Amino acid sequence: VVYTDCTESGQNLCLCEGSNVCGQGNKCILGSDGEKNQCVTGEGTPKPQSH
């Protein structure tokens, strides 16, 4: 499937490290401070179809 980037931090199932999806049980922190998209383990909300 083709996925899209994350719009908020603490979301999963979205592109984060490039075309690599932030897999389930991991969530993407959108940088808040010139930082880049960072997918880390934990848990997060699934990105809804359009915000």
CATH of the domain at 37: 2.70.10.10
Count of the separate structural domains present in the chain: 1
Cβ partners under 8 Å of residue 2, min gap 6: none
Token pair belonging to 13: 């199932």
DSSP, collapsed to helix, strand or coil, labels residue 29 as: strand
35: left (phi over 0), alpha (psi -120 to 50) or beta: beta
Experimental method: NMR
- Please, which contacts does 45-51 make with residues 24 or more away whose CB atoms are closer than 8 Å? 45/8, 45/10, 45/11, 45/12, 46/11, 46/12, 46/13, 47/4, 47/6, 47/7, 47/11, 47/12, 47/13, 47/14, 51/7
Spatial separation of the C-alpha atoms in residues 1 and 47, rounded to whole Å: 15
Residue 41: beta bridge partners? 26
Spatial separation of the C-alpha atoms in residues 26 and 48, rounded to whole Å: 16
Q: Which domain holds residue 10?
A: 1-51
